[model samples]
Target chain A: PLFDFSAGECRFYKTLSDSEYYVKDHVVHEKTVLPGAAIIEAAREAGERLYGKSVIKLSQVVWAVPITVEKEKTIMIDLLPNQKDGRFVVKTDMQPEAAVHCQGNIITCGDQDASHTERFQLDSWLTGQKRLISSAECYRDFRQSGLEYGASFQVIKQLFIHENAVLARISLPESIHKKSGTLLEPCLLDGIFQSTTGFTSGQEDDHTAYLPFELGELEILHAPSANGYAYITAADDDVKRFHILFMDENGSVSLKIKNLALKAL
Target chain B: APLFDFSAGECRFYKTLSDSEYYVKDHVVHEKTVLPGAAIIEAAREAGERLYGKSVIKLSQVVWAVPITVEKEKTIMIDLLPNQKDGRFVVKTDMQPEAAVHCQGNIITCGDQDASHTERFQLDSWLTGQKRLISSAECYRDFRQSGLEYGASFQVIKQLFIHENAVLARISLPESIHKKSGTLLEPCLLDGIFQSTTGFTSGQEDDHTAYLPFELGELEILHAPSANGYAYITAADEDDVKRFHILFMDENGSVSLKIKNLALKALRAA
Candidate 1:
């Protein structure tokens, strides 16, 4: 079992490895690193398994640094529940000096459906070619900036890119689909971040390396499938930060992410 | 160097940590025959009453710094220094008097409080919720596993009720502990109250941790607990470290002593 819950009801333990991982082929850095998106999805899996099926909200997600997946790295994620409330603090640790890699808040909202009230607005970018890009062409642009992606991460099938926004038809391979057992797959999130390459590559003046560092909110409005259309848009004032609305093929929103702040290298 | 000496605003006495005595011979913590904390209070009470006229003696900041081990020939010295309001005590061996001080405490003579105002509780009432009772011999076995090897005299707990980190004990002292005149607490009986705490976690087979007394913020001597009565104990903790608050009471719910913040160091698991 990947998660050992024998410590207590909410306590968990797991070792870090990318070799045995379902989606390990990543070339975004000189040395391959563990995805921050993977930590978010893993936390959600623990929440739904322990508390049963419900709307799980993750907020204030901060990614301090990407953990490089070396030989048997000490990677641990603990979801500690608040005694009085439904919320739990989601945090990671066990890197000697970089002990805490990322942290956020997670909670289960009982019997409430968020997708019932919210809707995705991507009709403005649904029109003509503009600055449209192809999957191989976009990944070629990524490798030039030393941010490369292989078969597992090359999920952006097609992209209609704007200087500030991107509407990508992103879908994962059967390899990532084979690893699915829970409400959300980290590979699905990996594909969403991979689609951001379409948005960043379209900007001509942008020269700094941008990595997802912070997020203000992540609400599961609807349960996501293996494939979805990611409507990623940047903050109107802040070019480095973005917001995403991942919708099902039916054009209904499944996941909404706000203030996806980036760190420029 | 007298049996009980008083001079120059001080009183001194020589006592064993015991016949290599009843409590002394039994109190062998980790193979060393060390003096128990209750005996230190017992000797301090005797010295305090003789030097400064005793109304009701209270011991504050009572710290058991180091163990005074005995090997038949060795005995520890007790020195008492008194002023107008309060007094102090130091226990050390004559071998190196200036250097090694085993124990220290402040003694003061005070008036009695209204018994009607104090909140009293029946110790036996705690037995209702407990799953099982720990026998007298069983408690000593638990103590030995925790490294406090005791003999028949120091084995004062007749039976006990334990739940998690709390204890409610019925202590029946042996005939050896005869009632002394103006004595607030018999050393053997006080040892029973401390010994009852052994039942708290001794049921865990692999753990051999011992909590030995090191300091006390305050020990207000109200009245002596009866030889055969109940003692109620609860620990207010900040994690592994604990601050035990004990109420020694007679059969009818009279609190004998209100022991607060009795600090102890967690000794070992071997």
Candidate 2:
């Protein structure tokens, strides 16, 4: 089957954005502090890139590449049998979503710019013909073919997913084109949060606390930079309404894409 | 002083193509090609059809004579070594090592009294290993050598793949030679010994059970159509003494010959 590149409507969705800033204590802080939205957007992009203009029938086994976070966490971003609705929906509530630290987008680029295009063709009809050709040659001549074996194919896919996740992580700062820094406090340096609240917080604390109450279990959810902005949610439900609470109660951060050029493979 | 002549000691060697697939039968290099076949011949150009260069001739006693009874075409491949002034011809069995059948036939002079005048006739049939040819098809050497050893070895850095519970065994001495009566072979191969599973196997059974219990990790020697047959060994562990068994087969399967080996090493102190 062939897909005419000129026919499909190229749609782009902002999966996440932390660029919007809010004034707090006379400081400009990123207000788009929801990460789930970005993950859903990445998932939507994967669908458009893979399915393209083809009308994938219901119950058809259409494969999808899951968007990963920092190349470490992988979340299933494919549309399942039960979830196959007539229209595609990009939202945080979707069953499967991409994992991202800041923001992500779902998009399909032209053939000329796709990186490792051959990788995406594994599910194409031509792939089956190639397999047959390789198998026939094995019997007539050398009695052996170099076609990719089942285990080998799985390994290749897994490695590709891992490499892509790493790509996403590495592409984070560069995408925004910004310099960011994490704050370090003297007492909380070693076991600051752990000693006081007896809760071991591992991330760098980048927020300021008022003198009336000492900061406890503080984590740098997200920080704004010159390229764009980032905001994090609070870890606890009660702290969701507290001031200086960046990430959502679920430890999520949303970053908005000010420029579309920054989102690419 | 007269020049030393190696030519006098040489005897002429020639090979004939067979119709039957060459195979081993009852511990002997058996040739099953039927009656009508072609034999290798080296000679000067003759008149008539002008069959020049190295060519194949009918396997009949009559030189280059096409037989009337054989209707199938008989083909042959020929090779001519450098000529010697002396009449002596040294037959080297090393060359033309294996028996290969020709799928086609050739044109040649008629040898039968009735058809002796006929320049060419189709000759087709299989030839057995019943006879040899000297200057003719009945003469020349059985130059196809079969006694030499053939095998392979590699320095494996690690046993990435191996069966921990393989049955290891090797053949005994008397079984490695040709014997019409007992065992049909003489065993020179070392008795198969089982290798230890310590390095290759996990202390406990793995959830995946990726280990093979019966596997042939190393092969010592092997021969095809065993006039002096082959031996297989069974071992329980790497260090366990291996017992050998002979492999006997009929004409049902194809003949295959190969060999292999492995070495032991001692670790150095740092």
Candidate 3:
């Protein structure tokens, strides 16, 4: 039976507390629910009035960086004049001379999972000097996603060099808050709890293995919460997936869960 | 004989007749010479050699302005940045370039026939908006030497207004000290000569008629031979040229001076 869902609103939203869910921008915040709780909580939250069952799934966390340069300048020059011979005839006319100096800096953060490039240079000169002066530096960052077979991965922070010193106070403007849930019902073949279901361990080919759920497509609907919190949800019905291999043998494979909830209240 | 020793501090004294004024006369070394048209160019070369290679020239002071802005390739306005924090100025322009056009003869003033009181070119009214616009007028004087004419004298004047009249004494650095030390002497005035030649008629036969030769590089001067009356004087070189003019107007009478070196500095110190 589901409790009448009337979670009272409070002033302070703490990291720990179920009523805090409303504090988040989204009704269903993704990262708060682990894959185990996500699948079941999603199911129960969606089906608490009918099936009395909860859905659960698996996921992981990941890193990205972006950068841009603003402004800069450089200057060079010689200090002396031309030389002459004994008869006042010009001998070694002033040779063209110059000195170069540059000024500017870069701003960047997190690690990027895509290919990008940035370039910059500076130029300046003094009076009676012939040669142009300049200095330059270039930078590029390329990152690839989908590596560790984890769920909900992203770059959170980045670093930059200021005046030959490294600084670490940068973070991404967007947050990844994705949550997924799948329903697993007890098998009723011959009136027996024969096999456990959901995106977890299952017996197959005489051995138990973790069944993997392939991500079909992902979309972020709202901006990440300015309060360092986000909300997301994922769902799939098709069986297409990757699996986590289990080497242990077992006559009976039973999946046990701790702290599973089915009611909304 | 040398009238005023260029190497000395004292100016040569010239005597005049009744109804005449004592003034500085231009002395040409040669009248009929081998060089005919080269006189102008020769004067320019000599003057240029005397003015080059100097230390810093500090400019300060202020001039009020009426600035007008218009659209053009370059903005047409006399709004120049202030040259000094305390508002003093020393303006100078290049004589070489100016001489190419205006310098026709030795020490020639542009419009004056005798060239003693030759009025150098003035910046457009739009350019000289401020009371004292140029920072270093001496620079122009230096460059003017290169464009000299055979018999013209180049002269510049700084028009200074007087307030709270007081008697002034002429103070100046001795020429020997100036040439030997190359140091700017403390501003002072020590002498006052009654210039009769200034603004006087040059024609000896027609005593009343104004002639070019009698035209003074400077004119009438009022000074204290003993004690200063309500008539007060104060002066400053704007660094353009050495000559200056101080004007005084009051209920008694209006008197002015074309002072080369007067005791203005001494009176100021007192």
Candidate 4:
């Protein structure tokens, strides 16, 4: 990472454990499974570094095989960069079939500046609905849904519902990575995924949980906010598609993730 | 940052500056690796927005303390001490081991009030038939000869238009740098606004002199910069120091951003 990889090809390696990666803090079904956000962060950071660009765009970020870590087990992450097309493959497993935990193509840094889209006014959007999900209840539902987390990864603070849309402020009030980088903090990003699980799909009579498997595209609009405003612009109990916008302070979408495909777990 | 609960008196931000970053890698001044002024504003505004909710911030009296060179994994700490009594924030960075304080600024945060009173400028209005056109390659070649080496990301200006007191340059992020996040001003584009001044000042200034950003009066962002636009530059300095007053206009002749009194200091690499 210290060397100048911008001039040519490069390979980046990392060993993740509870000691280093925030991924270990994420627990699912009593197992330490890596969240897709952390995987994307590693992928995005390395790709940005290799191409010598700060603003990076991640495409086709799909987590194939969930990397569940066992006690004393350290997951080895290998970031192989293909300079030709700016494609970086993220590998966690040693070798063999489906060992590629995540795969995506990056644009390094695209200069095609797109105009800002009309943003979600949370205050106006939440005027009709009063149903609110407390952080405690959200985490309870998350556990029942087989997703668990530690203090650092429990970034889903609160959520408010209005019909099919929800607005919540996701933060890591006391997490280690809060000081890391604002471009795309993994913990804050995972909070939105946690909010999806927090979505009241299984109501008083219905019980349901959805786990995101694919994020078709995530664009970093600007330097991200520390305490992000996540708006579940589109979601439903039975739908496979979800869209969430991590808004900056001024209601501008700082991070826009679209076509999030979730599987009923 | 909301990640932790710190008092209102101060806010701390931790960032690792690497050699591969777009700002450090491409923005070379006097052959030394220095963070761009826009990137520094990015950090400050991000922090200010986090502290004051959704708002726009204007930085004043910004002083670049030192050059944040690429030191492998250069970990830096940004401390924002908001003067509860005043409207400004004491901003500084502690680079690596000691207090490098590479930058300091008095930041003013305004509530989310969409200010639409920015002065608009059209590229065609300022162009004259006698204006000279410099190819992008020749301008960039001139850049390298001045000890300022810029890579692809910072190379946003494609055509240069020269005039009497100012210059208008056609600018676009390189094909490899286009993005949908144009809602927020991209550093590359803002840096391009600064680069547009080089063409107008080329023959006016002495040779072999390298200039870097030193101070700013204010940075006003009205809207996201359009992907393809022009950077209009004029001298906004006094006495012997060189400063630039730059304006960013979208293709349709809408001014999206303005920088006032951006003073530059000279530095050289052996």
- The best candidate by DockQ is 4
CAPRI quality of model 1:
incorrect
Best by TM-score: 4
Query: Which has the better TM-score: candidate 1, or candidate 4?
Result: 4
- After superposition, candidate 4 runs with Cα above 4 Å error: A1-265, B1-7, B84-98, B112-118, B179-183, B204-206, B237-240
Candidate 3 lDDT, tens digit per residue, B180-217? 12111111111112111111111132232211111112
lDDT of 3 by residue, A1-265 (tens): 0011111110110022222221121111122211222222222222211111121221220100100011211111111111110000111112334211111111111133243321111011112223211111000111111111111211212222222111111122233322222122101000010011111112232122222222221111111112211111112122322211101111111222111111110
Question: Model 2, A1-265: lDDT tens per residue?
Answer: 1101111111222322122210010111212122222233233333433334222111111112112222122232322211222223222233445422322222333346422211111222222221121222211221111111121011111001111110011011122222122122111111111111111111234122111111222222223211211121222311111112122223233222211110100
Superposed Cα deviation of residue B105, candidate 2 (Å): 43
**CAPRI rating of model 4:** incorrect
Taking the tens digit of each residue's C-alpha lDDT, what string does model 2 give over B54-168? 1112211112221111113333322212223212112122346564322111223332232212111111110122132122111101111211111111010111112232311
The CA-based lDDT of model 1 is what? 0.67
State every prediction's TM-score relative to the real structure: 0.45, 0.14, 0.15, 0.48
Error of 3 at B155 (Å): 20
Model 3 misplacement above 4 A:
A1-95, A98-265, B1-198, B202-258, B261-270
Find the candidate with the highest lDDT and give its number.
1
* Chain A fold similarity by TM-score, each prediction: 0.81, 0.19, 0.15, 0.83
| Interface RMSD (one decimal) of model 3 | 52.5
In candidate 1 the C-alpha lDDT for residue A13 amounts to: 40
Per residue, candidate 4 scores C-alpha lDDT tens digits across B1-270 of 322121223445456777777667888777677677667666666555544444544667777754666645676555666565223443344435554567777766664444547566766866565368888998888888888788888888898878777888889887874544422656677777777877745664457565667777878777667879888888864522578888888776788877888877666566
lDDT of 3 at B171: 18
